[PDB]
Amino acid sequence: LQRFENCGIFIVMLEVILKTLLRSTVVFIFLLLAFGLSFYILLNLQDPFSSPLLSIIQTFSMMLGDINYRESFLEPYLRNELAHPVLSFAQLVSFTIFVPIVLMNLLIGLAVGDI
Amino acid sequence: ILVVNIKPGMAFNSTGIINILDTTNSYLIKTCMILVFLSSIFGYCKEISNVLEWIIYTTGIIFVLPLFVEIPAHLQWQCGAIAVYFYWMNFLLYLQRFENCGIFIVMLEVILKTLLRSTVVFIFLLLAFGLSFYILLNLQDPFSSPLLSIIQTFSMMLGDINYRESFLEPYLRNELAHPVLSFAQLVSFTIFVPIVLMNLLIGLAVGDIADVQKHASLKRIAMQVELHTSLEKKLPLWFLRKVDQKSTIVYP
Amino acid sequence: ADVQKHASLKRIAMQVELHTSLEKKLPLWFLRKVDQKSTIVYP
Ligand SMILES: C[C@H]1[C@H](F)C[C@@H](C(=O)NCc2cc(-c3cnc(C(F)(F)F)nc3)ncc2C(F)(F)F)N1S(=O)(=O)c1ccc(F)cc1
Ligand SMILES: C[C@H]1[C@H](F)C[C@@H](C(=O)NCc2cc(-c3cnc(C(F)(F)F)nc3)ncc2C(F)(F)F)N1S(=O)(=O)c1ccc(F)cc1
Known part of the structure; x- marks a missing residue:
């Protein structure tokens, strides 16, 4: 579709943002790996974090701002199923600040700036 | 490992x-x-x-x-x-030394400090909802205590309010003690903090990252020059004379 | 991004409008007691 004037500029805008997002992972995958390996320690008794790979896929999927908060922090806390409660909520807010808010606004800053 | x-x-x-x-x-x-x-x-x-x-x-x-x-x-x-x-x-914070990584840590340093100046103000905008939902929803597990109420009303700010699970399903069972005011606070939250504050933070984020990109092509090189001169101030002079080089060939 | 055009002036305009509103309403002898003509700084 790049060969039609009606289409090609939206694929220039896709090429430009996808390449920008790619340069950004060479830094921020080491941010994801901090949360993925940390929630593997803190939430290990739960199905959705049971293994380091599933924990990094979960913290990848939480990125968009859908943390499943009641289902894996609160309902476990009110049943003592959290092993490290004071630190587990401190890692919840550290994720919520750094990723759904800081990184996902940093990427709107890049995308709006480039497009 | x-x-x-x-x-x-x-x-x-x-x-x-x-x-x-x-x-x-x-x-x-x-x-x-x-x-x-x-x-x-x-x-x-x-x-x-x-x-x-x-x-x-x-x-x-x-x-x-x-x-x-x-x-x-x-x-x-x-x-x-x-x-x-x-x-x-x-x-x-070690990746800042690489030419093609460091500018994204500069953009992270800028937006994180910009969010922190904005936090000194809007913690009181959180605490208004956190202590209000503690009164209005006290019969529910997520709001059982003021600290859990403020954690839940922090976690709602992304625009994931659990509306059916804590306003409408409770309302249709009379489990809301203050129904008219509880829905009036559900809208006041949905306006002020997943919409007004998050669109304000995108305003700050775009406004100041599009200002890092105004200098980025120089900031890359300024970081490299400040790195290499800091090393020339800390390496011993005989090593610089043995290792540095007055001319170089290239074969394109 | 338009408030951030004026922000570095708007900080100061808010401070000037605050301090001049108080300077109009504190009683005149109090300003003459308090409003010292020079200040030193030690960097
Ligand atoms: C660069 C940042 C942004 F801020 C947001 C996010 C993103 O959308 N990046 C795109 C991307 C992802 C992956 C990828 C593959 N497979 C996994 C694994 F292992 F989990 F399965 N993870 C990531 N590959 C290539 C790309 C690219 F081509 F687009 F560049 N990333 S982040 O670093 O992943 C990330 C950061 C924080 C966080 F909390 C969770 C994740
Ligand atoms: C400044 C505003 C933004 F608009 C959005 C949000 C944010 O992401 N700020 C980052 C942040 C949070 C916390 C924090 C820690 N611990 C709790 C507690 F007590 F709940 F556990 N709450 C907050 N600390 C430091 C930072 C900072 F370093 F990044 F600055 N905040 S807000 O004020 O919190 C907030 C506002 C409205 C709302 F409806 C809910 C919350």
Whole structure:
């Protein structure tokens, strides 16, 4: 579709943002790996974090701002199923600040700036 | 390597993993513990970057103290969850030396400081909802205590309000004590904080990252020049004369 | 991004409008007691 004037500029805008997002992972995958390996320690008794790979896929999927908060922090806390409660909520807010808010606004800053 | 080969919560020693004691990774666990311990005692001697290095080395020791001193399994992994996190968070602050990484850490430093100036104001906009939902929704598990109420009303700000599970399903069972005011506070939240504050933060984020990109093509080179001159101020002069070079050829 | 055009002036305009509103309403002898003509700084 790049060969039609009606289409090609939206694929220039896709090429430009996808390449920008790619340069950004060479830094921020080491941010994801901090949360993925940390929630593997803190939430290990739960199905959705049971293994380091599933924990990094979960913290990848939480990125968009859908943390499943009641289902894996609160309902476990009110049943003592959290092993490290004071630190587990401190890692919840550290994720919520750094990723759904800081990184996902940093990427709107890049995308709006480039497009 | 010491994390992913041991189930989190099990005590361990150089001899292996305790449940029973078993030896199936013992040479890997022994060598990784000695390497982390050495890295931490040398880490103190090389002593926000300066603060994170204390949090890492004072805690990565506690995760590995069972190389010498037996410790509660809970304290070993509660330290592991902190040390394993801050090792990777602080790895980004080493990436600033690479030409093509550092500008994204500059854009992270700028937006994080911009959000923190905005937090000194809007914590009181959170605490208004956090203590109001503590009154209006007290019969529900997520709002059972003022601290849990403020954690829940923090976590709602992304625009994930659990509306059916805490307003409408409770309303259709008369479990809301103050129904008219409870829905009036549900709208007042949905306006002020997943819409007005998050669109304000996107306004700050775009406005100041599009200003880093105004200088980025110079900031790359200014970081490199300040790095290489800092090393010329710290390398001994004979080494610079042996290693530096007056002319170079290129073959395109 | 338009408030951030004026922000570095708007900080000061808010401070000037605050301090001049108080300077109109504190009683005249109080300003003459308090409003010192020079100040030193030690960097
Ligand atoms: C660069 C940042 C942004 F801020 C947001 C996010 C992103 O959308 N990046 C695109 C991307 C992802 C992956 C990928 C593949 N597979 C996994 C695994 F292992 F989990 F399965 N993870 C990531 N590969 C290539 C790309 C690229 F081509 F687009 F560049 N990333 S982040 O670093 O992943 C990330 C950061 C924080 C966080 F909390 C969670 C994740
Ligand atoms: C400044 C505003 C933004 F618009 C959005 C949001 C945010 O992401 N700020 C980052 C942040 C949060 C916390 C924090 C820690 N711990 C709790 C507690 F008590 F709940 F556990 N709450 C907050 N600390 C430091 C930072 C900072 F360093 F980044 F600045 N905040 S807000 O004020 O919190 C907030 C506002 C409205 C709302 F409806 C809910 C919350």
